[PDB]
């Protein structure tokens, strides 16, 4: 109200409204799902078009051979944060000959977002990210909020109508965690999860975007006729 | 480059500058004009290290042309020479100094007088009836000391200049491929196309 | 962090007033009275030592300050602002003059430097004006004795005699009746003590009054002998006893 | 440093500081440009509220940027000097590096770029100035006339006016200027320019300035008497 | 007042949303992508008849294989064009090849959100970037001041955009010829323009693999306008 | 009014309202505690299980500084991470110049001055965390708690977050009933109980217990996380006390 | 943050005016009147000190008339402290020019430079403008005797006769009435003092309330002399012209 | 009304942020007292530990700035420690640059100058503290110099600070009106501490245990604080006469 003019101002109840408004931009964004087993980790994303002449906005970005994310919210902010992750993954490989741990990647994203919430002149990031990866401790899934809060999960969803997919994953928890050594079935579970968030529209060939990373699987993105198999 | 001469007579200033450009072993050009018009009644000839000479001359030219447009007025030869001196005095304590020596021949329209200024790369300025840079003075000054009069005509100045060039062509080891001669007077700047 | 106040805090209002300068002058008006009188053979500057508490040692608080051996200063208004201005004035006398010319600045030019500092606090980014008016007395070879007033705006004026602060209006009228161009230094001190008594409520003695002069050279205060041209400072702060002696002939 | 964003968008998609800069131009004295077949004429209004003026030394309204290009303006006089200085420096810089004087379009594009920059840089306000830039490209006999404004947009004009009451003189030019047959001579072009200012000026005395630019760096400013002869001939034809 | 980088309660940047309103006031620009090439067209919209209309430059070359049309505060586009041209040329210098149309577009869009208290405000202009490369063929992109860019088969921006976009919705198909696209841009421009469309107040351009980016002559466009008139009178 | 709109502004009371608003964010956070024992310190924190999809034991909250200091905080988690990152820089520079690992009181002031600095200007926001930290140095065990104002003191026991009142009361009983002191192993058990008891203020969702400790005898003066059997033993002891 | 307290000193009004410039001009209208008159054989500068005191040391006092170099002087109207900042900058510029070209700076070039400095404070930096208007009286060998004025906007103009400060409207009308082109310095001295005597807000015009200066080629032969009048010399010229 | 938020003048020529910083000074509800002996300078301050969970040994508002200089603070602990760290850094730098120990009055002036800057520069707020510096100076002898948020400072024969400063001040005034000397005429510092505690008891009307007080003592070449047991020995001597 009187306390939402900038990110440097607490409200009388201790809230940061500019951060909360940035969180609101994610809720307007298109739905994207993340889930993992013990061998693989999967991203599923519903892409959004402007109209029938337009292309469908890309949602998934590769960060390294073993790591990548999906976005929901301001796309240019995702480009900035993913670029930073690309650099940090790269610094780890060049300097230490070491693949960057997914947990450490989450810590770095948290700290980068935090600085934009405590200083004058700047603004919070207006995007949410779902980071998947396979490192020395197996498969991982992270959820990033521009408040700075990063959380490790078995599965999750962000964007508009993401609550439906999140409840489905909460039911299916015991089933999909056991899908080891079967990439197709894990993606099926993710496609079925994101279907719980659809209304009026359905998953078409240029609508759907899928990414996977695992034990002997580099981070790869599937679009176009490559996802027709799962429709 | 090599030889640049200057002489101030009754009503004009005459500048003579060699045409040769030599890059070590070969003479690459024999028609090089080692001068820049700074303003309608002011001419500057130059000699020194390759590249720096033309770079400095054109830089000065640009600055005087800028002043002329800003004020709608031509600076006096004295004022132009002082500006050039300061630039060279500034340059000598720089990271990489301009290795450039100049003569400035101008006709002052206010005083109705020709003026010749000699400035070396250190920023050493002197006003002279006649001047030179490098070894040119060593061969020519004894002739100029003898024949020079302050009331000489332009034609007499050219004749005395011819005698100087002839002595240079006789006793200098280097072939400087003749000189381009230019006259600065009340009507402006013109080139003597047969010398 | 970083100072993000790069804009002026003093600005013109629709009526053409510079509010912050006017308000700084109001702070000066609330300040304790100080005065200055110029004689033929000297200058005197004086003020009241308004002690905040009787447990406080008011001798440790100097309202009258030496700027150079021949220049002194007194103020009315905010004490802390004065103290830092004295520090800056002492330094600028060296950096912008003595380290260049090998001699102390003339009164008018040191005043000019202090004035410049006060002007800049009226235009520079993220600062308020100084809440003081200064009276600067001094001597130099070619200008003789002089007395100047400097205001929060940076404006300065030379005076034969003047007063600033609390009871300045009444004090200036008192000085107009007594001042002439034939006054000796002792006469000016006498008039200074008379003028200052009117604005003082409580105790009036050497311990509650601070008074200094710009007068003859004091070779006894030089600290060394041997150089004929060096004859000592013209600034001298009067002692508590010296003030009380002149209060009996009052 | 002072970084405050003074030029910003409003809810309706307007940048008010740029729009208010145009209001400063509206207040400025009228300036007009007309191009003939082999010339361009720049006319300028002088407000007669200021007499006891020394006209020898007072800043003239038309400024040479180079020997072949001129610049006139409407708006804040102090602001215009900054643009004129920058334009003159760029003109010499162009000659120094390209070894050819600026084209009229290039010089216009530079000045317009400076104006635009001051509409999205921190801590600065836009120029309260619109300019008319006229001249001839090197070794070219085709007349050139361009206009710039505070936003930084620029364009070419057969004839144009800026400043106070420019709506009126543009009205005149739109019905009197024929594109198929522009003022064939210097006389005809100056006459049409003086006529256009007489719609707005008041007295045809020391209130009208005229500068003629011809090809090959031929620029001359007309005197009071020369302009007065145009003023005389125009009204004697009007008495009919 | 309030920050230039402030979020609204809905999660949108105030300044970005306001710049989008400035673009709505701009003159119309249309692009249509085909398998034979991409066509770009604009409304010139001269403010007066004395303004020489061929000096209005709202279609611009970025490289031989990339063109660009603008709508909104067109002065703001100049630094964007300069950056685009520099990026295209620089990539050729570093890699001895043409730059991808998408990569060029992405580079332009990186400038967009570089504002705060960098430039003091967002750009008040939208761009249609059209071009061809070997990997993805003929392409058309819409670059906004939000930093977002969408690829389009066909797109209209400016004051007549939503009416034009509805028209492009019906008319575009994957088998359009270059000639058919040219007439289609002219037809839709004529529909949304205030003044009557002719060769002086409208401008066409195209990008083909063979000939590269070309702005059409007024004589060439005049013939296409006459061809349009006759085929509309044909039924 | 308007005094609460900008940081570093004194109200007519002499209060910095922005700092007081930062405290509200702390009070909204989960419960964290610290217990000073005979030869060391124990830290414990409540982790709310928002969903079944959270991977157990993965989202670690307690942080180590150097090798002998533990830090836990309640409020805005990112703000706490920023403070610990600074603390790690401070500890590194101290050890670089002076060789010895940073003493706990010395480390306390480094965090204190940094947090206080974020109350001096309107261009920055105060920290939205209260931090409980400490460890073992050459003079023995030390426990500290640091507030958004930059204020800190030494403690026998400390608590912050939503269930701080409940926790404080439990800590006060331990101080009274053990004037001679508490063992490190006892302190771990007691820490588990107190978090379980403090969870009544957050009873809607279930939680995960996380404990760490530094002890001269039990961990050689190094900070370690309580894991496996010792953690389960503490959970069992805690569950027995609430029933 | 800090934005809250920013007055924004460099913005246009809806009418296209610069707030701070306009308000600075309002400030200057309350300053003591300064007049400059240009004649064929010299220039006169006359100015009124603001309500003085009998205890002010006049002979060592300077608030109105300042020397920029041997050929150029200024009359000040506005904040004296602001004026001294600009005056020192102008003195330096004159010396920079003299060092560079070995010729005295032409009057207009100095005036343009100071005016450009004033302009900058209205367009960038977020600082308040200088509350000062200058009258420049000077001589060079190009245009001869010249009078200029500049104000806080950074705009400058040339004049035959001009006033700044208080009552300029009344002063300018009186000057416009009695000024002629073939006028001489001694006549201009009389006009300036007569104009101040009629426009003043004081009861009577006396020597202690005035500062006076002339720039004459009344220097022996082909040179120019500046004369800052002493208190006794102002008293004499007041008697000569028949005002006291 | 933004003249109340930053340190610019109000229409009355006042600085409200400075005035409000003086009010923050009494937020701790603690009173301090300082007196001078023949050979020493003593400072006492109330100690309040309201929470049983606190470690009472870490609760302190007296600071050892240098070997010779002590400082007691009236105001919140964050600002107190800010001032303490800076004073320590300034004192150490002074010794390094000028080759002798920084005098108490010179440090006071330096900190007062820093405070003055916060009253003139807008981006910096005043510190809500009053700083009382004590020492036995090698030139001036026993010294008390006190600084406030306005940037004011002065020397004192004796002084008091806190919510009930007036009661203590008047009590001290009345004693020095009797004795007619500028100090406590006593040989040992122990008896000067006893004087200080006795007169605080009289002025406040409250009794003190060993944990209710905090004492700092300055002698030639060192400043030190007393332990609870040292204070207890002081309290016993007071009660036995």
Swiss-Prot record, chain A:
- Is the keyword Cytoplasm assigned to this protein? yes
Name of the protein in question = Proteasome subunit alpha type-6
Please tell me what else the database record remarks about this protein: Present with 7210 molecules/cell in log phase SD medium.
Q: Could you tell me what this protein does?
A: The proteasome degrades poly-ubiquitinated proteins in the cytoplasm and in the nucleus. It is essential for the regulated turnover of proteins and for the removal of misfolded proteins. The proteasome is a multicatalytic proteinase complex that is characterized by its ability to cleave peptides with Arg, Phe, Tyr, Leu, and Glu adjacent to the leaving group at neutral or slightly basic pH. It has an ATP-dependent proteolytic activity.
This chain's source organism reads Saccharomyces cerevisiae (strain ATCC 204508 / S288c)
What Gene3D superfamilies does the record point to? Glutamine Phosphoribosylpyrophosphate, subunit 1, domain 1
Q: Which PANTHER family match?
A: PROTEASOME SUBUNIT ALPHA/BETA
Which proteins does it associate with, and in what oligomeric form? The 26S proteasome consists of a 20S proteasome core and two 19S regulatory subunits. The 20S proteasome core is composed of 28 subunits that are arranged in four stacked rings, resulting in a barrel-shaped structure. The two end rings are each formed by seven alpha subunits, and the two central rings are each formed by seven beta subunits. The catalytic chamber with the active sites is on the inside of the barrel.
> What InterPro entries does this protein's entry cite?
Ntn_hydrolases_N, Proteasome_alpha, Proteasome_alpha-type, Proteasome_asu_N, Proteasome_sua/b
UniProtKB/Swiss-Prot annotation, chain C:
Query: Where found, per UniProt?
Result: Cytoplasm; Nucleus
Whether Protease counts among this entry's keywords is no
**Highest taxon of the lineage:** Eukaryota
For the biological process aspect of GO, one term held by this record is: proteasome-mediated ubiquitin-dependent protein catabolic process
The UniProt feature for the cross-link Glycyl lysine isopeptide (Lys-Gly) (interchain with G-Cter in ubiquitin) gives its location as: 108
CC per GO annotation:
nucleus; proteasome complex; proteasome core complex, alpha-subunit complex; proteasome storage granule
A Pfam family name for this chain? Proteasome
- InterPro entries linked: Ntn_hydrolases_N (IPR029055), Proteasome_alpha (IPR050115), Proteasome_alpha-type (IPR023332), Proteasome_asu_N (IPR000426), Proteasome_sua/b (IPR001353)
Q: Which UniProt keywords apply?
A: Cytoplasm, Isopeptide bond, Nucleus, Proteasome, Ubl conjugation
Task: Give the similarity note.
Answer: Belongs to the peptidase T1A family.
Other noteworthy facts: Present with 7060 molecules/cell in log phase SD medium.
Q: How does it assemble?
A: The 26S proteasome consists of a 20S proteasome core and two 19S regulatory subunits. The 20S proteasome core is composed of 28 subunits that are arranged in four stacked rings, resulting in a barrel-shaped structure. The two end rings are each formed by seven alpha subunits, and the two central rings are each formed by seven beta subunits. The catalytic chamber with the active sites is on the inside of the barrel.
State the name under which the record lists this protein.
Proteasome subunit alpha type-2
Naturally occurring in which organism (per UniProt): Saccharomyces cerevisiae (strain ATCC 204508 / S288c)
High-level lineage: Eukaryota, Fungi, Dikarya, Ascomycota, Saccharomycotina
Curated annotation (Swiss-Prot), chain G:
Per UniProt, subcellular location reads as:
Cytoplasm; Nucleus
Q: Which domain of life is it from?
A: Eukaryota
Which Gene Ontology BP terms does the record give?
proteasomal ubiquitin-independent protein catabolic process; proteasome core complex assembly; proteasome-mediated ubiquitin-dependent protein catabolic process
Q: Where is this cross-link: Glycyl lysine isopeptide (Lys-Gly) (interchain with G-Cter in ubiquitin)?
A: 99, 198, 230
Q: Which GO terms describe its cellular component?
A: cytosol; nucleus; proteasome complex; proteasome core complex, alpha-subunit complex; proteasome storage granule
Concerning its family, UniProt says:
Belongs to the peptidase T1A family.
Protein function: The proteasome degrades poly-ubiquitinated proteins in the cytoplasm and in the nucleus. It is essential for the regulated turnover of proteins and for the removal of misfolded proteins. The proteasome is a multicatalytic proteinase complex that is characterized by its ability to cleave peptides with Arg, Phe, Tyr, Leu, and Glu adjacent to the leaving group at neutral or slightly basic pH. It has an ATP-dependent proteolytic activity.
Instruction: Spell out the protein name for this chain.
Output: Proteasome subunit alpha type-3
Curated annotation (Swiss-Prot), chain H:
Any Pfam family matching the protein: Proteasome
Keyword Acetylation present in the record's keywords: the answer is yes
Q: Which example biological process does GO assign this protein?
A: proteasome-mediated ubiquitin-dependent protein catabolic process
Enumerate the subcellular locations listed in this protein's record, separating them with semicolons: Cytoplasm; Nucleus
What stretch or stretches form a coiled coil here?
none
Q: What is its main location?
A: cytoplasm
Q: Which UniProt keywords apply?
A: Acetylation, Cytoplasm, Isopeptide bond, Nucleus, Phosphoprotein, Proteasome, Ubl conjugation
Annotated InterPro entries: Ntn_hydrolases_N, Proteasome_alpha, Proteasome_alpha-type, Proteasome_asu_N, Proteasome_sua/b, Proteasome_subunit_alpha6
Task: Say which domain of life the source belongs to.
Answer: Eukaryota
This entry carries the following GO cellular component terms, namely:
mitochondrion; nucleus; proteasome complex; proteasome core complex, alpha-subunit complex
Which positions carry Phosphoserine? 227
Family that this chain belongs to: Belongs to the peptidase T1A family.
Main role? Answer: The proteasome degrades poly-ubiquitinated proteins in the cytoplasm and in the nucleus. It is essential for the regulated turnover of proteins and for the removal of misfolded proteins. The proteasome is a multicatalytic proteinase complex that is characterized by its ability to cleave peptides with Arg, Phe, Tyr, Leu, and Glu adjacent to the leaving group at neutral or slightly basic pH. It has an ATP-dependent proteolytic activity.
Q: What else is known?
A: Present with 15200 molecules/cell in log phase SD medium.
Q: What is this protein called?
A: Proteasome subunit alpha type-1
């Amino acid at each position: 109200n009187n306390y939402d003019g900038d990110t440097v101002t607490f409200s009388p109840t201790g809230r940061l409204f500019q951060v909360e408004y940035a969180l609101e931009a994610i809720k307007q964004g298109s739905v994207t799902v993340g889930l993992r087993s013990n061998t693989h980790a999967v991203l599923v994303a519903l892409k959004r078009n402007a109209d029938e002449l337009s292309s469908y906005q890309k949602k998934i970005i590769k960060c390294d051979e073993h790591m990548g994310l999906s976005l929901a919210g301001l796309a240019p902010d995702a480009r900035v944060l993913s670029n930073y992750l690309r650099q940090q993954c790269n610094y780890s490989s060049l300097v230490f000959n070491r693949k960057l741990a997914v947990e450490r990647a989450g810590h770095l994203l948290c700290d980068k977002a935090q600085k934009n919430t405590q200083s004058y002149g700047g603004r919070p990031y207006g995007v949410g990210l779902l980071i998947i990866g396979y490192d020395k401790s197996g498969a991982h899934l992270l959820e990033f909020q521009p408040s700075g809060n990063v959380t490790e999960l078995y599965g999750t969803a962000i964007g508009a109508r993401s609550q439906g997919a999140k409840t489905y994953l909460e039911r299916t928890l015991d089933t999909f965690i056991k899908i080891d050594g079967n990439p197709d079935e894990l993606i099926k579970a993710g496609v079925e999860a994101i279907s719980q968030s659809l209304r009026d529209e359905s998953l078409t060939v240029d609508n759907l975007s899928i990414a996977i990373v695992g034990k002997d699987t580099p981070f790869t993105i599937y679009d176009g006729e490559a996802v027709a198999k799962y429709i | 480059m090599d030889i640049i001469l200057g002489i101030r007579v009754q009503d004009s200033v005459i500048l003579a500058s060699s045409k040769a450009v030599t890059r070590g072993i070969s003479v690459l050009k024999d028609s090089d004009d080692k001068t820049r018009q700074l303003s309608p009644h002011t001419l500057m000839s130059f000699a020194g290290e390759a590249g720096d000479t033309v770079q400095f001359a054109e830089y000065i030219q640009a600055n005087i042309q800028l002043y002329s447009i800003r004020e709608d007025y031509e600076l006096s030869p004295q004022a132009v020479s002082s500006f050039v001196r300061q630039e060279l005095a500034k340059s000598i304590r720089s990271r990489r100094p301009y290795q450039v020596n100049v003569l400035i021949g101008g006709y002052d329209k206010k005083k109705n007088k020709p003026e010749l200024y000699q400035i070396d790369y250190l920023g050493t300025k002197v006003e002279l009836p006649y001047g030179a840079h490098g070894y040119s003075g060593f061969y020519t000054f004894s002739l100029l000391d003898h024949h020079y009069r302050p009331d000489m005509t332009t034609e007499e100045g050219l004749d005395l200049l011819k005698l100087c060039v002839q002595e240079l062509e006789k006793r200098m080891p280097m072939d400087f491929k003749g000189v381009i001669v230019k006259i600065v007077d009340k009507d402006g700047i013109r080139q003597v196309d047969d010398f | 962090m970083t100072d993000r106040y790069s804009f002026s805090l003093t600005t013109f209002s629709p009526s053409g007033k510079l509010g912050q300068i006017d308000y700084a002058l109001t702070a000066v008006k609330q300040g304790v009275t100080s005065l200055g009188i110029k004689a033929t053979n000297g200058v005197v500057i004086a003020t009241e030592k308004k002690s905040s508490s009787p447990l406080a040692m008011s001798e440790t608080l100097s309202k009258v300050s030496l700027l150079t051996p021949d220049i002194g200063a007194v103020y009315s208004g905010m004490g802390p602002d004065y103290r830092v201005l004295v520090d800056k004035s002492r330094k600028v006398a060296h950096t912008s003059y003595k380290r260049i010319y090998g001699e102390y600045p003339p009164t008018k030019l040191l005043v000019s430097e202090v004035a410049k500092i006060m002007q800049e606090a009226t235009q520079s980014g993220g600062v308020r004006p100084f809440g003081v008016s200064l009276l600067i007395a001094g001597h130099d070879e070619f200008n003789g004795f002089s007395l100047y007033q400097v205001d929060p705006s940076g404006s300065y004026f030379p005076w034969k005699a003047t007063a600033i602060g609390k009871g300045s209006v009444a004090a200036k009228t008192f000085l107009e009746k007594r001042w002439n161009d034939e006054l000796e230094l002792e006469d000016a001190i006498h008039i200074a003590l008379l003028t200052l008594k009117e604005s003082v409520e409580g105790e009036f003695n050497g311990d509650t009054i601070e008074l200094a002069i710009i007068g003859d050279e004091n070779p006894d205060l030089l600290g060394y002998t041997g150089i004929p041209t060096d004859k000592g400072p013209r600034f001298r702060k009067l002692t508590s006893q010296e003030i009380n002696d002149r209060l009996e002939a009052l | 440093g002072y970084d405050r964003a003074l030029s910003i968008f409003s809810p309706d998609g307007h940048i008010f500081q740029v729009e208010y800069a145009l209001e400063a131009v509206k207040r400025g004295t009228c300036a007009v440009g007309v191009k003939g077949k082999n010339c361009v004429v720049l006319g300028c209004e002088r407000r007669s509220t200021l007499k006891l003026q020394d006209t020898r030394i007072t800043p003239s309204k038309v400024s040479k940027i180079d020997s072949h290009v001129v610049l006139s303006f409407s708006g804040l006089n102090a602001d215009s000097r900054i643009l004129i200085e920058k334009a003159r420096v760029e003109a010499q810089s162009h000659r120094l590096t390209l070894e050819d004087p600026v084209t009229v379009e290039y010089l216009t594009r530079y000045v317009a770029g400076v104006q635009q920059r001051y509409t999205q840089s921190g801590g600065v306000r836009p120029f309260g100035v619109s300019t008319l830039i006229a001249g001839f490209d090197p070794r070219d006999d085709e007349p050139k006339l361009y206009q710039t404004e505070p936003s930084g947009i620029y364009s070419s004009w057969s004839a144009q006016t800026i400043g106070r009451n420019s709506k009126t003189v543009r009205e005149f030019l739109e019905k009197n200027y024929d594109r198929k047959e522009p003022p064939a001579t210097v006389e005809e072009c100056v006459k049409l320019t003086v006529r256009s200012l007489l719609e707005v000026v008041q007295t045809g005395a020391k209130n009208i300035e005229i500068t003629v630019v011809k090809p090959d760096s031929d620029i001359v400013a007309l005197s009071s008497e020369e302009i007065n002869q145009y003023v005389t001939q125009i009204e004697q034809e009007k008495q009919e | 007042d309030r920050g230039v980088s402030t979020f609204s309660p809905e999660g949108r940047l105030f300044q970005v949303e306001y710049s989008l309103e400035a673009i709505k006031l701009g003159s119309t620009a249309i692009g249509i992508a085909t398998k034979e090439g991409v066509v770009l067209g604009v409304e010139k919209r001269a403010t007066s008849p004395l303004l020489e209309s061929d000096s209005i430059e709202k279609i611009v070359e970025i490289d031989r294989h990339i063109g660009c049309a603008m709508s909104g505060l067109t002065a703001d586009a100049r630094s964007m064009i300069e950056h685009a041209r520099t990026a295209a040329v620089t990539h050729n210098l570093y890699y001895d090849e043409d730059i991808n149309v998408e990569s060029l577009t992405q580079s332009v869009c990186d400038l967009a959100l570089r504002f705060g208290e960098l430039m003091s405000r967002p750009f008040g202009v939208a761009l249609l970037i059209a071009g061809h490369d070997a990997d993805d063929g003929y392409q058309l992109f819409h670059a906004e001041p939000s930093g977002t860019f969408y690829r389009y088969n066909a797109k209209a921006i400016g004051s007549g955009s939503e009416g034009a976009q509805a028209e492009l919705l019906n008319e575009w198909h994957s088998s359009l010829t270059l000639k058919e696209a040219e007439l289609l841009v002219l037809k839709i421009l004529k529909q949304v323009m205030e003044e009557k469309l002719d060769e002086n107040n409208a401008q066409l351009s195209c990008i083909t693999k063979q000939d590269g980016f070309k702005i059409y002559d007024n004589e060439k466009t005049a013939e296409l306008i006459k061809e349009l008139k006759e085929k509309e009178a044909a039924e | 009014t308007g005094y609460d709109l900008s940081n570093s502004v004194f109200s007519p009371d002499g209060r910095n309202f922005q700092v007081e608003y930062a405290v509200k964010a702390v009070e909204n956070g989960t419960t964290s505690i610290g217990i000073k024992c005979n030869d060391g310190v124990v830290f414990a924190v409540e982790k709310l299980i928002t969903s079944k999809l959270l991977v157990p034991q993965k989202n670690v909250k307690i942080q180590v500084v150097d090798r002998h200091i533990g830090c836990v905080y309640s409020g805005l988690i990112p703000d706490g991470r920023h403070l610990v990152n600074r603390g790690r820089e401070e500890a590194a520079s101290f050890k670089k110049l002076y060789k010895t690992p940073i003493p706990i009181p010395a480390f306390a002031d480094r965090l204190g001055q940094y947090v206080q600095a974020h109350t001096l200007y309107n261009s920055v926001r105060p920290f939205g965390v209260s931090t409980i930290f400490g460890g073992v140095d050459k003079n023995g065990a030390h426990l500290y708690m640091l507030e958004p104002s930059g204020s800190y003191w030494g403690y026998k026991g400390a608590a912050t977050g939503k269930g701080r009142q409940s926790a404080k009361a439990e800590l006060e009983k331990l101080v009274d009933h053990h004037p001679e002191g508490l063992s490190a192993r006892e302190a771990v058990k007691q820490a588990a109980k107190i978090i379980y008891l403090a969870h009544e203020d957050n009873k809607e969702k279930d939680f995960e217990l996380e404990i760490s400790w530094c002890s001269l005898s039990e961990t050689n003066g190094l900070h370690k996380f309580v894991k496996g059997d010792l953690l389960q033993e503490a959970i069992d002891f805690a569950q027995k006390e609430i029933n | 943050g800090s934005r809250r307290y920013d007055s924004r000193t460099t913005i246009f009004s809806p009418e296209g005016r610069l707030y701070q410039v306009e308000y600075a001009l309002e400030s200057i209208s309350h300053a003591g009147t300064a007049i400059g008159i240009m004649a064929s054989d010299g220039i006169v500068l006359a100015a009124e000190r603001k309500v003085t005191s009998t205890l002010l040391e006049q002979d060592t006092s300077t608030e109105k008339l300042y020397k920029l170099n041997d050929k150029i002087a200024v009359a000040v109207a506005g904040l004296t402290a602001d004026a001294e900042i600009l005056i020192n900058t102008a003195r330096i510029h004159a010396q920079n020019y003299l060092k560079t070209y070995n010729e005295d700076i032409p009057v207009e070039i100095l005036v343009r430079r100071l005016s450009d400095i004033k302009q900058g404070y209205t367009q960038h930096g977020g600082l308040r403008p200088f509350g000062v208007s200058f009258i420049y009286a000077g001589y060079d060998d190009r245009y001869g005797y010249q009078l200029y004025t500049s104000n806080p906007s950074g705009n400058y103009t040339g004049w035959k006769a001009i006033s700044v400060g208080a009552n300029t409207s009344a002063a300018q009308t009186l000057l416009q009435m009695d000024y002629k082109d073939d006028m001489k310095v001694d006549d201009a001295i009389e006009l300036a003092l007569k104009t101040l005597s009629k426009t003043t807000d004081s009861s009577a015009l006396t020597y202690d309330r005035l500062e006076f200066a002339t720039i004459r080629k009344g220097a022996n032969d082909g040179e120019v002399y500046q004369k800052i009048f002493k208190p006794q010399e102002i008293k004499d010229i007041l008697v000569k012209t028949g005002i006291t | 009304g933004y003249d109340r938020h930053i340190t610019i003048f109000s229409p009355e020529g006042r600085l409200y942020q400075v005035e409000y910083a003086f009010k923050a000074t009494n937020q701790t509800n603690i009173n301090s007292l300082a007196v001078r002996g023949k050979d020493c300078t003593v400072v006492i301050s109330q100690k309040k530990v309201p929470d049983k969970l606190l470690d009472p040994t870490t609760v302190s508002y007296i600071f050892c700035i240098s070997r010779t200089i002590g400082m007691v603070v009236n105001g919140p602990i964050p600002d107190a420690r800010n001032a303490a760290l800076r004073a320590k850094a300034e004192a150490a730098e002074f010794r390094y640059k000028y080759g002798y120990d920084m005098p108490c009055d010179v440090l006071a002036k330096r900190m007062a100058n820093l405070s003055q800057i916060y009253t003139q520069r807008a981006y910096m707020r005043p510190l809500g503290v009053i700083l009382t510096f004590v020492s036995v100076d090698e030139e001036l002898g026993p010294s008390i110099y006190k600084t406030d948020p306005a940037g004011y400072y002065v020397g004192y024969k004796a002084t008091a600070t806190g919510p009930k400063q007036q009661e203590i001040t008047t009590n001290l005034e009345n004693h020095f009106k009797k004795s007619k000397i500028d100090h406590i005429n006593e040989e040992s510092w122990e008896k000067v501490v006893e004087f200080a505690i006795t007169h605080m008891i009289d002025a406040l009307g409250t009794e003190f245990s060993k944990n209710d007080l905090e004492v700092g003592v300055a002698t030639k070449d060192k400043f030190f604080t007393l332990s609870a047991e040292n204070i207890e020995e002081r309290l016993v001597a007071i009660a036995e006469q």
